[PDB]
Amino acid sequence: SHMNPPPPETSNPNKPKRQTNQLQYLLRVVLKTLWKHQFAWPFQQPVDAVKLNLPDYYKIIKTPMDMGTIKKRLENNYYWNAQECIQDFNTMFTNCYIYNKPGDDIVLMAEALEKLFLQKINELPT
Amino acid sequence: SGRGXGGXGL
């Protein structure tokens, strides 16, 4: 047998919370634009290794991250700094390139989403 | 490094 790990933590009740213009942009513009993209659906929740029959996924990926987690974290004010959120997006993309062979469909989807992510981050407000 | 996930409609 093999099991899914628990999904990443999405609330830190002991961490101070704030809403900033940049965090609002990350949620309402960056995450929203990627979420609605045609290639987003594999990235909208944690990789379900059981239902996808990938017993090696969490043997290889020890820092999983996904856009559903990022959305919940933003909604919970989990991030104090915009850079913490950006790091989670970066982790999500790099995990995909670690696990999957170059040229696989999922990798081309990640590369397209990453390009859009960088385009959105180019216009991060003050 | 992994088994991979096959086709995704591309």
UniProtKB/Swiss-Prot annotation, chain A:
The NET domain mediates interaction with a number of chromatin proteins involved in transcription regulation (NSD3, JMJD6, CHD4, GLTSCR1 and ATAD5). The C-terminal (CTD) region mediates interaction and recruitment of CDK9 and CCNT1 subunits of the P-TEFb complex. It is also required for maintenance of higher-order chromatin structure. Phosphorylation by CK2 disrupt the intramolecular binding between the bromo domain 2 and the NPS region and promotes binding between the NPS and the BID regions, leading to activate the protein and promote binding to acetylated histones. In absence of phosphorylation, BRD4 does not localize to p53/TP53 target gene promoters, phosphorylation promoting recruitment to p53/TP53 target promoters. The record marks 100 as: Acetylated histone binding. Ubiquitously expressed. It comes from the Eukaryota. Changing residue 100 to A: Abolishes binding to acetylated histones. Signal peptide: none annotated. It is linked to Cornelia de Lange syndrome 6: A form of Cornelia de Lange syndrome, a clinically heterogeneous developmental disorder associated with malformations affecting multiple systems. It is characterized by facial dysmorphisms, abnormal hands and feet, growth delay, cognitive retardation, hirsutism, gastroesophageal dysfunction and cardiac, ophthalmologic and genitourinary anomalies. CDLS6 inheritance is autosomal dominant. Residues 18-124 form the Bromo domain. Belongs to the BET family. This is Bromodomain-containing protein 4.
